[PDB]
Design a protein around this ligand. Structure first.
Ligand SMILES: [Mg+2]
Ligand SMILES: [Mg+2]
Length: 286
């Protein structure tokens, strides 16, 4: 029913933040050099309070607000990212490029990072049914990243989230059928063809690698919690691997499957729930 369906959208959005917050605790740490992370303790290189997240969730929130206030508007997305960037003390370059030229698609070919993946969920929640969803995802990535593999990885995640929200089984999600044999960057091609079945040696910042790490954690985890712990304990760019895993696993398992203690400790939990529901209602209208 309605509740079950809403649960998936709320799960994907909140899961993103939960993963960001948990992973942030061990960001930059080499795999296997620290005790297993299992709870929201805060910490990390930014000495975050428990349940607090990073730029991953910040951008996701900005994108969410942009979509709700004016549909798909990359210019407005960048106005918001820039406004958040300046109030704070590859992406910074994209923002300054936009500030100087007015070009909203300020990503360059050097941007192959995972930034476009960490903030994706909001777009799929609101434009789930749009026939050009994958194209909108590419445009959303292009605002800050322009490398072929980053754009394609974003399209793959957009597909994954849409299918997961629609109830597709784990086996179908991991099979990535529409991408099999597709003309993709070699690195991403290796991921789609099964590269993710092997455990990563660390949490990668490279888009294809981040996607592969999230897919691995999703494949091996039997529930949201188990998969999330697998993802963040890879260390490295754990906040982002955690955020990507969170989006996919959140849409798949639903909000009700995410540990209550993680959600209760999450900063701006209620504001995100409101945004997720607003975005979902938006996908059912116009
Ligand atoms: Mg981050
Ligand atoms: Mg990160």
């Amino acid at each position: 029913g309605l509740k079950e369906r809403q649960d998936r959208r709320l799960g994907a959005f909140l899961g993103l933040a939960v993963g960001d917050a948990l992973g942030a605790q061990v960001e930059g740490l080499p795999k296997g050099t620290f005790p297993e992370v299992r709870e929201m303790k805060g910490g990390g290189p930014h000495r975050l309070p428990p349940g607090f997240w990073t730029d991953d969730t910040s951008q996701a929130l900005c994108l969410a607000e942009s979509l709700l206030q004016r549909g798909f508007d990359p210019k407005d997305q960048m106005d918001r990212y820039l406004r958040w960037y300046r109030e704070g003390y590859a992406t910074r370059r994209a923002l300054e490029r936009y500030a100087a030229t007015g070009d909203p698609y300020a990503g360059d070919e050097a941007g192959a990072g995972n930034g476009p993946l960490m903030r994706l969920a909001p777009l799929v929640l609101a434009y789930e049914n749009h026939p050009d969803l994958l194209s909108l995802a590419r445009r959303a990535a292009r605002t800050t990243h322009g490398a072929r593999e980053a754009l394609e990885a974003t399209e793959v995640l957009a597909w994954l989230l849409r299918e997961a929200l629609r109830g597709a089984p784990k086996e179908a999600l991991l099979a990535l059928e529409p991408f099999r044999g597709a003309d993709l960057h070699p690195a991403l091609r290796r991921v789609v063809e099964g590269g993710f079945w092997e455990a990563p040696e660390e949490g990668p910042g490279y888009a294809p690698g981040t996607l592969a790490a999230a897919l691995w954690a999703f494949a091996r985890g039997r529930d949201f919690e188990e998969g999330m712990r697998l993802a963040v304990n890879l260390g490295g760019d754990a906040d982002t691997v955690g955020a990507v895993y969170g989006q996919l696993a959140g849409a798949y398992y639903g909000l009700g499957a995410i540990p209550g203690r993680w959600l209760r400790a999450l900063h701006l939990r209620e504001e995100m729930e409101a945004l997720a529901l607003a975005l979902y209602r938006m996908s059912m209208a116009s």
